[PDB]
Design a protein around this ligand. Structure first.
Ligand SMILES: O=C(O)/C(=C/C1CC1)Oc1cccc(C(=O)O)c1O
Length: 418
């Protein structure tokens, strides 16, 4: 059957993460698990893959890689290829780099060749885990048998975590901050977010770390993946974009930090962001469809606003994502200038950090979550990355401390490789 009853006492995050580890290894496949609105979707197995790089677009199907050059907007390029996958299957999953959002500002020339912009795939099988049920899509006996074996076994106990020191500043985050402050004071831009990488000196178990962290984090969206040599996990603090089948587009910028409601620094910054999103959404919206619906409402508690619109017929979901990308929250104000500065003052390319993780539907749906509070493994390297907004009054030591706080979303929950 399509449906299985959820076992009592079992958290959905825990079960989906267990499925992700056990079932995929069994059948030799890559995966992405995405948490959206009480559903944990495990997209298992790469049926077809879209790789969009700075200098090339690749579609790999059935063992055949078909390479194309592309020009113009990255979203249009990505959209066309993804649309093709979605004729064949219902949903597509992936990640989008920070670097995806640089073309709109004409910064693409800065990118080295073979710089990844996006990886989007359609799954061989889907498993959806929620509180009530497990739903199976395109699951063969092999997958089905595996889910069945796990379900019987139950979830593994999470081992004790292993600590890491975040006090070093090898990349000189503090000095880099100062430089930003000077540029701000000189009126180059209002804001930039700068970040630092922290290497983790041991290998971690990604699914087990994801479970431990999820227990102590309540995020807007979350993810765990093994894709194309990359392991990653994260607790996304913001939604970049949600586009519905009906054409309604949403973005929800959050303020961060009683005194949230009254504090001036936040309010000015949140308002400026709200203005930015509204302006961006407007370019892709039916005239007169754009509104801010829940302004500066308190929603951990956060300040946030909901910006909504109707996707114009001339435009599409990728265009909406490009209009809103990268998020102000991890870039700067004004955006073009903040992004420019990031090439200069931060370690580039960013890749997954400050990019998005995406779920797309054949119905026209898009869900894109901002990648922050995440861990990465590529090659032999395991790392964490956190950053801070920098404005004219910012202090390098305080900003360093801020990074440490953000790192603490993950630093206590690292489970070493098994
Ligand atoms: O500014 C904040 O507190 C913030 C707000 C989010 C919207 C709710 O979170 C972040 C902003 C920028 C960078 C990071 C980071 O982890 O790298 C970050 O977590």
């Amino acid at each position: 059957s399509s449906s299985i009853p959820m076992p009592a006492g079992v958290n959905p995050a825990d079960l989906a993460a267990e499925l992700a580890a056990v079932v995929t290894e069994s059948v030799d496949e890559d995966y992405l698990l995405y948490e959206c609105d009480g559903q944990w979707v495990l997209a298992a197995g790469v049926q077809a893959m879209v790789e969009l790089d700075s200098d090339e677009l690749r579609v790999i199907r059935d063992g055949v890689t078909r390479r194309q050059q592309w020009s113009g907007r990255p979203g249009a390029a990505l959209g066309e290829a993804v649309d093709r996958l979605l004729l064949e299957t219902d949903q597509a999953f992936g990640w989008v780099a920070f670097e995806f959002g640089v073309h709109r500002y004409g910064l693409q020339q800065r990118l080295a060749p073979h710089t990844p912009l996006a990886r989007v795939f359609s799954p061989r099988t889907r498993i959806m885990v929620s509180e009530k049920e497990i739903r199976l899509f395109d699951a063969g006996i092999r997958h089905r048998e595996a889910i069945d074996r796990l379900l019987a076994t139950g979830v593994r106990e999470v081992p004790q975590s292993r600590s890491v020191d975040v006090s070093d500043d090898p990349s000189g985050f503090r000095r880099r901050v100062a430089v930003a402050v000077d540029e701000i004071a000189a009126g180059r831009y209002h804001k930039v977010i700068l970040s630092r990488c922290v290497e983790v000196p041991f290998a971690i178990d990604f699914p087990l770390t994801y479970r431990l962290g999820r227990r102590h984090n309540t995020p807007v969206r979350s993810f765990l993946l093994q894709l194309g040599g990359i392991r990653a996990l994260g607790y996304s603090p913001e939604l970049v974009t949600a586009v519905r089948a009906d054409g309604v587009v949403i973005t929800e910028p959050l303020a961060g930090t009683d005194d949230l409601e009254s504090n001036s620094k936040e309010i000015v910054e949140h308002a400026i962001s709200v203005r930015s999103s509204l302006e961006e959404i407007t370019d892709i919206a039916e005239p007169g469809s754009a509104a801010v619906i829940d302004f500066m409402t308190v929603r951990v508690q956060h300040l946030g606003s909901t910006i909504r619109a109707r996707l114009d017929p001339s435009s599409d979901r990728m265009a909406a994502l490009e209009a809103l990308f990268p998020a102000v929250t991890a870039s700067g104000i004004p955006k073009a200038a903040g992004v420019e500065a990031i090439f200069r003052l931060d370690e580039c390319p960013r890749g997954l950090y400050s990019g998005a993780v995406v779920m797309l539907s054949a119905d026209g749906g898009l869900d894109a979550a901002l990648t922050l509070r995440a861990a990465y493994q590529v090659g032999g390297r395991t790392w964490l990355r956190a950053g801070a907004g920098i404005i004219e009054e910012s202090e390098p030591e305080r900003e360093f401390e801020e990074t440490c706080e953000k790192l603490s979303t993950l630093t206590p929950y690292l489970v070493a490789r098994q």
